[PDB]
């Protein structure tokens, strides 16, 4: 029942899935071998006749380094060997190479693996695709997989957690092209797209987690915390249980508006944790702070459409209502005029577990936030201004042309992003 | 049309404002200074800067600009020094902080092989004009202050300052340097066969290039119009005091400041 | 998205680098809306609230 299939695309997706599955195993008590010494796990883990607990995951990547490391890692006995799909050579930061040349020869067996995972599931809630449009296979192969899942699996929920490229720091120069081209699929064939750019997580870890040297490991641990906070509703019993459909229908006002920010609070270090009285109102305020989110996107530069709250721990609707009322009374953050309600709430009795050796301190109560707001146009405007400066005179376009797309796809993506900007601009308009 | 892209701005407007003000140049000249003398001082200052850059010597006009020649070292056949002189123009950090402009060239790049900078010789400027070095220094400070002032007062259309090296055209928060072909030709003639790099010539912000008939020559503005307009803008920028100021002669009346 | 439609009744989010090593986002303040109770409902309060 209530199963969910996880898919991890690209290096970013693979590492995020590593952290997420580490945290999930820690929560469910499933050892890396794949057995519990002494059935909420049924969402993410499947029983086997031999007593093993195989995760319902597909680690799909075009190059062998990351998947081979996962195979040789601690969870060798945990992960199903066929569920770890590895190609021979990567897309090399090319959406064309990941979408037209190399992506096609692996997508067929990727769908075969997805079918072999789905037929086992009976009450499949949907798909959780972790990827990054900055890369090539994360964008191209991810787009192909999303299209192939949409064309055959119907209206199943699809939560695409995407590590979008950052406003000013780049680990690649063609990631504007990659993200702009992949926004086609991430605008038509993803149910809910989640912004997860790295700089907001870096700032969170710098100022709140109190770490002078954060890395991808810490970033992925925080992403896994957010993922667990979102998906604990369909696993553990809670005061208010909400599903993937339950919150997508609340966070998607229009078919073209499904990009959402995440935040998690409290996200504090051990030293800072006992220095504060983390109440429901306090954690809600820390959530609604524009600084406390996992996207370099400013709500104060926009308007709110909808906000979904995942409370975990000893949280009570008693204080949930008070926190919501205080947030509404606050003036700096503005909700759009056509959505007076704007709030979605779900509470769970399970406090967030802490990974051993991690940097999060245990908190008796926590809350994650997934929000659709008009401010998304800020990050889209930044990223396609990057794209326009890039595409003014066609630099790094011969690669895409030679790797098997017509160059008019770049144009089509440009008008698609222009339409996304314009309706982001004009759906926040006052009636 | 007189709606932009045509109405070029001469230095005469800055000179008129400097003459019609309570500024440093007026204090130094005891009210005898004239916009004509300001124009003469600016023209000879441009000529002196042009001569300094001709002499392979970078020239810095205080709080306004630092025109420098980037030199590139190439060893010839017999290892004799062959020079590739690339003129480069960057505003003073004081001016950039003063009027919130940004330089296209970063400063360490500017000074990596910039020649040694020297102040423009105010004494020579005064000798050529016929006035005192103190008068020249006051006039140039007032002129550069009002040149920066123009934009913050009101900034879309061009303000083109003439320099011997070239013309600097001012936009809102942005500027554009056009090295004059005459100065470039003089550099090529006097370089001694070393080699001169033609600098990037951005598209002229005014039709006809920087050497275009400005508002004075076209007839858009006159001295009387500038006088009335500068009085009006001084009144507009002036602010009232909160409470009566006693003043002399027992006149508690307020006063714009 | 222009500031003079977006900030009709709220202060602009003055961007400031300190506190971040990357692009500044904003900081919320304590300003409250004027009392606008929905018409006719009883003065319903779940927990102690800051009085406007």
């Amino acid at each position: 029942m209530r199963e969910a299939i996880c898919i991890h695309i690209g290096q970013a997706g693979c590492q995020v899935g590593n952290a997420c599955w580490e945290l999930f195993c820690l929560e469910h008590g499933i050892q890396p071998d794949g057995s519990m010494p002494s059935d909420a796990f049924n969402t993410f883990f499947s029983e086997t006749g031999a007593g093993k607990h195989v995760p319902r995951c597909l680690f799909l990547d075009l190059e062998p380094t990351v998947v081979d490391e996962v195979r040789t890692g601690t969870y060798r006995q945990l992960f199903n060997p066929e569920q770890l799909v590895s190609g021979k050579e990567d897309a090399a930061n090319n959406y064309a190479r990941g979408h037209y040349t190399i992506g096609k020869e692996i997508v067929d067996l990727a769908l075969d693996r997805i079918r072999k995972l789905a037929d086992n599931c009976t009450g499949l809630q949907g798909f959780m695709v972790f990827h990054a449009v900055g890369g090539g296979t994360g964008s191209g192969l991810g787009a192909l997989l999303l299209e192939r899942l949409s064309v055959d699996y119907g209206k199943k929920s699809k939560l695409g957690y995407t590590v979008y490229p950052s406003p000013q720091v780049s680990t690649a120069v063609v990631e504007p092209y990659n993200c702009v081209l992949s926004t086609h699929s991430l605008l038509e064939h993803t149910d809910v797209a989640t912004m997860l750019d790295n700089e907001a997580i870096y700032d969170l870890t710098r100022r709140s987690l109190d770490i002078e040297r954060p890395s991808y490991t810490n970033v992925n641990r925080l992403i896994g915390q957010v993922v667990s906070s979102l998906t604990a509703s369909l696993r553990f019993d809670g005061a208010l249980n909400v599903d993937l459909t339950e919150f997508q229908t609340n966070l998607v006002p229009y078919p073209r508006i499904h990009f959402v920010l995440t935040s998690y609070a409290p996200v504090v270090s051990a030293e800072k944790a006992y220095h504060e009285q983390l109440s429901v109102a306090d954690i809600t305020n820390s959530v609604f702070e524009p600084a406390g989110m996992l996207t370099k996107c400013d709500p104060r530069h926009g308007k709110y459409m909808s906000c979904c709250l995942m409370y975990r721990g000893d949280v009570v609707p008693k204080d949930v209502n008070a926190a919501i009322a205080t947030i509404k009374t606050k003036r700096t953050i503005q909700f759009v005029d056509w959505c007076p309600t704007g709030f979605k709430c779900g509470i769970n009795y399970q406090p967030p577990t802490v990974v051993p050796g991690g940097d999060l301190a245990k908190v008796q109560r926590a809350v994650c936030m997934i929000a659709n707001s008009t401010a998304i146009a800020e990050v889209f405007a930044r990223i396609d201004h990057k794209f326009d400066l890039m595409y003014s005179k066609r630099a790094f376009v011969h690669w895409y042309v030679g790797e098997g797309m017509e160059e008019g796809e770049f144009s089509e993506a440009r008008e698609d992003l222009a339409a996304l900007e314009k309706d982001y601009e004009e759906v926040g308009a006052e009636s | 049309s007189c709606s932009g892209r045509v109405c070029r701005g001469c230095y005469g407007e800055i000179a008129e404002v400097v003459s019609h003000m309570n500024g440093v140049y007026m204090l130094q000249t005891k009210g005898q200074g004239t916009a004509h003398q300001l124009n003469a001082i600016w023209r000879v200052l441009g000529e002196q800067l042009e001569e300094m850059l001709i002499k392979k010597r970078s020239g810095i006009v205080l709080d306004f600009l630092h025109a420098s020649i980037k030199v590139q070292r190439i060893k010839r056949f017999d290892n004799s020094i062959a020079l590739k002189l690339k003129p480069q123009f960057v505003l003073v950090p004081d001016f950039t902080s003063k009027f919130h402009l940004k330089n296209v060239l970063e400063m360490q790049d500017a000074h990596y092989h910039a020649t040694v900078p020297n102040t423009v010789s105010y004494i020579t400027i005064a000798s050529i004009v016929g006035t005192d070095r103190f008068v020249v220094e006051a006039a140039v400070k007032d002129s550069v202050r009002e040149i920066g002032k123009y934009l913050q007062r009101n900034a879309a259309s061009t303000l083109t300052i003439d320099i011997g090296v070239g013309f600097v055209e001012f936009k809102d928060r942005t500027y554009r340097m056009k090295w004059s072909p005459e100065f470039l030709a003089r550099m090529k003639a006097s370089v001694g066969t070393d080699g001169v790099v033609t600098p990037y010539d951005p598209p002229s912000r005014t039709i006809g290039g920087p050497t275009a008939p400005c508002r004075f020559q076209k007839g858009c503005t006159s001295e009387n119009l500038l006088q009335t307009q500068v009085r009006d803008t001084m009144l507009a920028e002036s602010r009232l005091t909160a409470a009566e100021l006693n003043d002399g002669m027992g006149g508690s009346s307020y006063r714009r400041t | 998205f222009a500031p003079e439609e977006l900030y009709k009744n709220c202060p602009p989010p003055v961007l400031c680098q300190p506190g971040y090593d990357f692009t500044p986002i904003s900081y919320n303040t304590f300003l409250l809306n004027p009392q606008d109770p929905p018409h006719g409902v009883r003065s319903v309060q779940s927990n102690f609230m800051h009085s406007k």
């Binding site: - | 932009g4 701005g9 934009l151 009101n154 879309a156 503005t221 307009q229 009006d232 | 009709k8 009744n9």
Partner: peptide, 28 residues
């Protein structure tokens, strides 16, 4: 206490814009 309604019956958002600061093209 300032809640102005359109004749159709829609609440217009309040404004605190004093006026238009005419940032213009330069002239003295």
């Amino acid at each position: 206490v300032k809640k102005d309604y359109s004749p159709i019956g829609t609440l217009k958002a309040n404004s605190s814009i004093v006026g238009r600061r005419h940032a213009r093209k330069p002239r003295f």
